[PDB]
Design a protein around this ligand. Structure first.
Ligand code: NA
Lengths: 76, 79
């Protein structure tokens, strides 16, 4: 999945710019650590509702997240 | 309450579907997904995976970028 790889990269990019570890993000998203780790290794098929929990955990605005996603897609 | 992003994703799928002249059944046929899953999405009653969204975008003949532009606009126009 090309789009899953891009969404996963943006997640990681924002997590790392905020200084959060995977455990920090798991906790704030109310998701399991091993699920966050799986997403970032591009090895898990994320839903829209889980994506929203991750955006809330990151405290990133929905519009900003999708602008970043578009930028990353356009690199290709 | 219900997921904001899910309701907006759902709404953009329906909007594009109708702009292309397609029925729910048509979109199911072209996405290779069950018609009852299409219908559930649009009634804001079904979550979907990123990979199902990609199949829907292929059924809609819309690029990822155009889909996300439309999503951004619909989020902005919500108050
Ligand atoms: Na839905």
């Amino acid at each position: 999945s090309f789009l899953l790889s891009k969404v996963s990269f943006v997640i990681k990019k924002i997590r790392l710019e905020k200084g959060m570890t995977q455990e920090d993000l798991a906790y704030k998203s109310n998701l399991d650590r091993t699920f966050i780790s799986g997403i970032e290794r591009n090895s898990r098929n994320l839903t829209i509702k889980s994506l929203e929990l991750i955006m809330k955990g990151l405290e990133v605005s929905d519009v900003v997240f999708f602008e970043m996603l578009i930028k990353e897609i356009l690199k290709h």
